[PDB]
């Protein structure tokens, strides 16, 4: 199948038409997305099959064909870019300064950017182009707007 590095749409035909349930990242032969996008199910890449290899519902992450490869981290200081991939619309970079989720287990970056639900799993980048985490697990705040965590896994 298509093993090429880059950002990919996740699509289903089980609803009406072809529907974008979310987004993902291919790197070093491994496909990375959020657990709530696939719920752990297998994926088709043309003739090709992708099988789930690692996942955790609490981190809300899943890898396919191999272990989690994305290890870069927000430095706590700089702007970043959401490589947003909205349903039926073209990829598109958005630059933002992250906010903070304060938790009982320590602090994580947050991106206050609003997109449809099927944008879930769109990658966040640092200035060198490295993926620091996935967009699309977070909270709805006062306004009615959405804030996502910068969700990142661990590389072995």
């Amino acid at each position: 199948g298509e093993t090429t590095d880059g950002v990919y749409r996740v699509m289903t035909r089980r609803l009406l038409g072809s529907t974008q349930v979310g987004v993902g990242v291919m790197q070093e032969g491994v496909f990375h997305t959020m657990w709530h996008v696939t719920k752990g199910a297998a994926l088709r890449s043309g003739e090709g099959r992708l099988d789930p290899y690692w996942g955790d519902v609490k981190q809300d992450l899943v890898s396919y064909c191999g272990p989690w490869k994305l290890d870069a981290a927000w430095d706590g200081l700089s702007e970043v870019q959401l490589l947003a991939v909205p349903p039926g619309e073209r990829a598109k970079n958005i630059q933002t300064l992250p906010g903070i989720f304060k938790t009982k287990d320590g602090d994580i970056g947050a991106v206050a950017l609003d997109y449809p639900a099927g944008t879930s799993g769109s990658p966040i980048l640092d200035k060198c182009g490295r993926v620091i985490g996935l967009y699309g697990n977070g909270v709805v705040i006062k306004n009615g707007s959405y804030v996502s965590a910068i969700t990142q896994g661990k590389r072995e």
Binding site: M11, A41, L83, Q95, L113
Partner: protein, 39 residues
Amino acid sequence: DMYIERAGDITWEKDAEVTGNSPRLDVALDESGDFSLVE
């Protein structure tokens, strides 16, 4: 059956659109992976 379609190279774009605010929020993470606003 779900399937994947390539949508872009992962690069930083100079003169991307710059927007969004940067809230500092207190949040809880449950066993199901749901974040919630703690106030």
